[PDB]
Design an enzyme around this catalytic site. Structure first.
Site, PDB file in Angstrom:
ATOM      1  N   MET A 100      -6.377  -1.082  -8.815  1.00 57.32           N
ATOM      2  CA  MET A 100      -6.748  -2.371  -9.319  1.00 57.32           C
ATOM      3  C   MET A 100      -7.765  -3.046  -8.392  1.00 57.32           C
ATOM      4  O   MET A 100      -7.828  -4.260  -8.322  1.00 57.32           O
ATOM      5  CB  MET A 100      -5.476  -3.202  -9.498  1.00 57.32           C
TER       6      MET A 100
ATOM      7  N   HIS B 268      -8.022  -1.088   0.308  1.00 49.92           N
ATOM      8  CA  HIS B 268      -7.743  -1.002   1.736  1.00 49.92           C
ATOM      9  C   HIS B 268      -7.531   0.491   2.097  1.00 49.92           C
ATOM     10  O   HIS B 268      -7.748   1.380   1.263  1.00 49.92           O
ATOM     11  CB  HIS B 268      -6.529  -1.880   2.116  1.00 49.92           C
TER      12      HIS B 268
ATOM     13  N   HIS C 250      -5.425   2.844  -0.219  1.00 48.39           N
ATOM     14  CA  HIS C 250      -6.247   3.407  -1.298  1.00 48.39           C
ATOM     15  C   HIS C 250      -7.185   4.503  -0.811  1.00 48.39           C
ATOM     16  O   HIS C 250      -7.403   5.479  -1.522  1.00 48.39           O
ATOM     17  CB  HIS C 250      -7.109   2.333  -1.937  1.00 48.39           C
TER      18      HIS C 250
ATOM     19  N   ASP D 124     -17.069  -5.194  -1.791  1.00 42.34           N
ATOM     20  CA  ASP D 124     -16.368  -4.413  -0.762  1.00 42.34           C
ATOM     21  C   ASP D 124     -15.872  -3.079  -1.369  1.00 42.34           C
ATOM     22  O   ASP D 124     -16.187  -2.007  -0.831  1.00 42.34           O
ATOM     23  CB  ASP D 124     -15.203  -5.198  -0.132  1.00 42.34           C
ATOM     24  N   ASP D 125     -15.157  -3.147  -2.504  1.00 44.31           N
ATOM     25  CA  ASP D 125     -14.638  -1.937  -3.181  1.00 44.31           C
ATOM     26  C   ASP D 125     -15.669  -0.824  -3.317  1.00 44.31           C
ATOM     27  O   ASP D 125     -15.461   0.283  -2.826  1.00 44.31           O
ATOM     28  CB  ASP D 125     -14.092  -2.268  -4.568  1.00 44.31           C
TER      29      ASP D 125
ATOM     30  N   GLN E 230     -16.864   0.620  -0.010  1.00 46.29           N
ATOM     31  CA  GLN E 230     -15.857   1.510   0.534  1.00 46.29           C
ATOM     32  C   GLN E 230     -15.905   2.894  -0.134  1.00 46.29           C
ATOM     33  O   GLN E 230     -15.755   3.928   0.539  1.00 46.29           O
ATOM     34  CB  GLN E 230     -14.482   0.876   0.408  1.00 46.29           C
TER      35      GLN E 230
ATOM     36  N   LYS F  61       4.011   4.009  -1.705  1.00 46.92           N
ATOM     37  CA  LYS F  61       4.317   2.629  -1.435  1.00 46.92           C
ATOM     38  C   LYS F  61       5.027   2.044  -2.646  1.00 46.92           C
ATOM     39  O   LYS F  61       6.113   1.496  -2.529  1.00 46.92           O
ATOM     40  CB  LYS F  61       3.046   1.853  -1.050  1.00 46.92           C
TER      41      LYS F  61
ATOM     42  N   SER G 196      -1.029  -3.332   2.035  1.00 48.81           N
ATOM     43  CA  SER G 196      -0.949  -3.865   0.683  1.00 48.81           C
ATOM     44  C   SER G 196      -1.950  -5.001   0.598  1.00 48.81           C
ATOM     45  O   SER G 196      -2.189  -5.704   1.585  1.00 48.81           O
ATOM     46  CB  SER G 196       0.464  -4.413   0.428  1.00 48.81           C
ATOM     47  N   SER G 197      -2.510  -5.193  -0.591  1.00 46.61           N
ATOM     48  CA  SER G 197      -3.423  -6.305  -0.856  1.00 46.61           C
ATOM     49  C   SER G 197      -2.700  -7.639  -0.678  1.00 46.61           C
ATOM     50  O   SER G 197      -3.339  -8.647  -0.392  1.00 46.61           O
ATOM     51  CB  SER G 197      -4.012  -6.191  -2.278  1.00 46.61           C
ATOM     52  N   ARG G 198      -1.369  -7.624  -0.822  1.00 45.60           N
ATOM     53  CA  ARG G 198      -0.511  -8.816  -0.630  1.00 45.60           C
ATOM     54  C   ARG G 198      -0.467  -9.322   0.811  1.00 45.60           C
ATOM     55  O   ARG G 198      -0.180 -10.503   1.046  1.00 45.60           O
ATOM     56  CB  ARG G 198       0.946  -8.518  -1.049  1.00 45.60           C
TER      57      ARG G 198
HETATM   58  N1  LIG Z   1      -0.204   1.348   1.942  1.00 43.33           N
HETATM   59  C1  LIG Z   1      -0.454   2.234   0.976  1.00 43.33           C
HETATM   60  N2  LIG Z   1      -0.448   3.569   1.226  1.00 43.33           N
HETATM   61  C2  LIG Z   1      -0.689   4.475   0.267  1.00 43.33           C
HETATM   62  N3  LIG Z   1      -0.949   4.072  -0.977  1.00 43.33           N
HETATM   63  C3  LIG Z   1      -0.975   2.744  -1.292  1.00 43.33           C
HETATM   64  C4  LIG Z   1      -0.725   1.783  -0.313  1.00 43.33           C
HETATM   65  N4  LIG Z   1      -0.820   0.581  -0.877  1.00 43.33           N
HETATM   66  C5  LIG Z   1      -1.113   0.759  -2.168  1.00 43.33           C
HETATM   67  N5  LIG Z   1      -1.210   2.070  -2.421  1.00 43.33           N
HETATM   68  C6  LIG Z   1      -1.493   2.688  -3.695  1.00 43.33           C
HETATM   69  O1  LIG Z   1      -2.673   2.155  -4.333  1.00 43.33           O
HETATM   70  C7  LIG Z   1      -2.390   2.097  -5.788  1.00 43.33           C
HETATM   71  C8  LIG Z   1      -2.373   0.621  -6.270  1.00 43.33           C
HETATM   72  S1  LIG Z   1      -3.161   0.425  -7.897  1.00 43.33           S
HETATM   73  C9  LIG Z   1      -1.910   1.122  -9.067  1.00 43.33           C
HETATM   74  C10 LIG Z   1      -2.453   1.130 -10.518  1.00 43.33           C
HETATM   75  C11 LIG Z   1      -1.358   0.976 -11.593  1.00 43.33           C
HETATM   76  O2  LIG Z   1      -0.448  -0.170 -11.338  1.00 43.33           O
HETATM   77  C12 LIG Z   1      -2.035   0.888 -12.991  1.00 43.33           C
HETATM   78  O3  LIG Z   1      -3.276   0.140 -12.974  1.00 43.33           O
HETATM   79  C13 LIG Z   1      -0.988   2.682  -5.994  1.00 43.33           C
HETATM   80  O4  LIG Z   1      -1.108   4.101  -6.099  1.00 43.33           O
HETATM   81  C14 LIG Z   1      -0.362   2.271  -4.656  1.00 43.33           C
HETATM   82  O5  LIG Z   1       0.898   2.913  -4.374  1.00 43.33           O
END
Ligand SMILES: Nc1ncnc2c1ncn2[C@@H]1O[C@H](CSCC[C@@H](O)CO)[C@@H](O)[C@H]1O
Ligand SMILES: Nc1ncnc2c1ncn2[C@@H]1O[C@H](CSCC[C@@H](O)CO)[C@@H](O)[C@H]1O
Lengths: 280, 286
Positions: free
Chosen positions: B37, B41, B44, B85-86, B89, B157, B193-195
């Site tokens: 989404m 970071h 991803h 940024d996205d 990256q 995650k 996390s983006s949070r």
């Molecule tokens: N710290 C992390 N480490 C590894 N993967 C991560 C991390 N944080 C986020 N992600 C990973 O990045 C993705 C987020 S977008 C998911 C899309 C879905 O809801 C439908 O649109 C997901 O695979 C997370 O587990």
């Protein structure tokens, strides 16, 4: 290692991965894979699906035979069905067990849009989830270029189009015109259940629809009234609905193309039919 | 549409990425899909790198803030959007395809046909948010159909989400391999996390309790389940201004099965208004 496939013969597979591997290998050899989903007990209606599939240049025809418990003893003549297919020159039959299709029970499923609660969904509010779920799975197993459905079950055909658009599926949906008995009765396995009074009365469904399609030069009300008159002349025919809708089963436009659909019970036997209508 | 290799190619039209993907697959290249989404970071980027190392692969990263997996009001407008940024990256990562669909192109008919997840979707993250995973599995299905990748990458995650994606893929016989990628952590253990950007310095300091509690539990677990769970709980209880929503020890598939030796321990906690998740592998008696 890809399973055995013998060209020009009926090759029968019960394992989803087996038909999947053969379908994939065949497509790479420049075959176009056609899928004809059925629930067995094949009549000439189903053969029209098969023949539609066959006439595509390069076709290899896959006919699934699978009584999907998710959209419900249904008629079951396995040896006979395979002979019909063999006689038609179909090269692949896919005959999975329920355990094979549903190894984990009913878990993830397709939820249809609101049209699934109308018309045939009134009596059977979960029928179309069952249909779309098994159809999605066959599509993913077989990965056909084209998939074939009879216009007789028009609402099913419309919802399959919605499944394919909504989930961005890479398959052409082909609707095949209803095959009819000599008097216009839509072919169906259920027809054999009608006693002679019922079978004579059953003709009013198709007669009603053809009347309407010709009455339609006088407009939508004349079409509907002509259809109801014909149904009103039949004894023992309990009309569940008679409805004019646009071709996607939305509300009928003021003018233009529509579909008229009817469902009726003759004793314990429920019959459906539908016809294209052009308003004015 | 054009595809320049060794460069990032951005396609917005589903038909465009579908055509290019298919073209690429025919020429030999294996298609990797990394659904996101945006607001990317290093978590991803581990997904991207895992995709990138698959031999002969072309990597498609989708960026789409899926309105269907949000509840009202509220949260959708509040999700971070940092597309400059996205894309930068992704370019720095040597990704060849970014897929950036519009809402109209994904939901031209609104919510019509959808995916209904199994009962797992009503549990844990699904409890407060009972439509959440229907939203996720619907968009993931559509992405897999558009892109038709050989393999699709998800982080551990969001472990329940990974589990449900594996269920989607099994249940609908999707011809794709699901690859789970380990969680990327900050130096102190905080799961990326983006949070995390919504944690002030104090809340950020407190937030280490999540990963601390789970790693303590993973080590205490030689002494059994009670010990593992009580170790986690003590770390969480000692953390200023962490409100635990859940802490659960489950079988690795999260489903209608008891925990034996192997499990997953999952935590969700609030730091102010910011809701954080983390989980860890647990081996009981090991
Ligand atoms: N710290 C992390 N480490 C590894 N993967 C991560 C991390 N944080 C986020 N992600 C990973 O990045 C993705 C987020 S977008 C998911 C899309 C879905 O809801 C439908 O649109 C997901 O695979 C997370 O587990
Ligand atoms: N008389 C007929 N004419 C044309 N097609 C027909 C006829 N009778 C039946 N069919 C067609 O044969 C197929 C029946 S099995 C469908 C399987 C689906 O529910 C997923 O499990 C269907 O396409 C009917 O419309």
């Amino acid at each position: 290692a890809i399973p055995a496939f013998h060209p020009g013969e009926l090759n029968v597979y019960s394992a989803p991965g087996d038909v999947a591997d053969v379908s994939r290998a065949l497509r790479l050899t420049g075959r176009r894979v056609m899928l004809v989903p059925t629930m067995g007990a094949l009549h000439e209606g189903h053969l029209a699906l098969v023949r539609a599939a066959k006439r595509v240049p390069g076709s290899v025809v896959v006919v699934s035979i699978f009584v999907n418990p998710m959209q419900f003893a249904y008629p079951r003549t396995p040896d006979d069905d395979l002979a019909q297919l063999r006689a038609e020159g179909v090269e692949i039959a896919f005959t999975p067990t329920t355990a094979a299709m549903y190894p984990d029970g009913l878990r993830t499923t397709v939820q249809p849009g609101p049209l699934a609660a109308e018309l045939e969904g009134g009596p059977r509010p979960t029928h179309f989830a069952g249909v779309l779920t098994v159809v999605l799975k066959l599509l993913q197993i077989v990965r056909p270029d084209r998939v074939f459905f009879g216009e007789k079950d028009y609402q099913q055909l419309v919802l399959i189009r919605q499944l394919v658009a909504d989930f961005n599926l890479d398959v052409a949906v082909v609707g095949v015109p209803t095959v009819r008995e000599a008097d216009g009765l839509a072919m169906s396995s259920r027809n054999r259940y009608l006693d002679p009074a019922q079978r004579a009365a059953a003709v009013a469904l198709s007669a009603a629809l053809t009347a309407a399609a010709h009455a339609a030069t006088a407009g939508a009300q004349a079409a509907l009234d002509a259809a109801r008159a014909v149904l009103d002349a039949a004894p023992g025919v309990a009309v569940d609905y008679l409805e004019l809708r646009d071709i996607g089963l939305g509300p009928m436009p003021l003018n233009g193309s529509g579909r008229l659909l009817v469902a009726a019970r003759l004793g314990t036997t429920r019959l459906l039919d539908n016809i294209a209508i052009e308003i004015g």
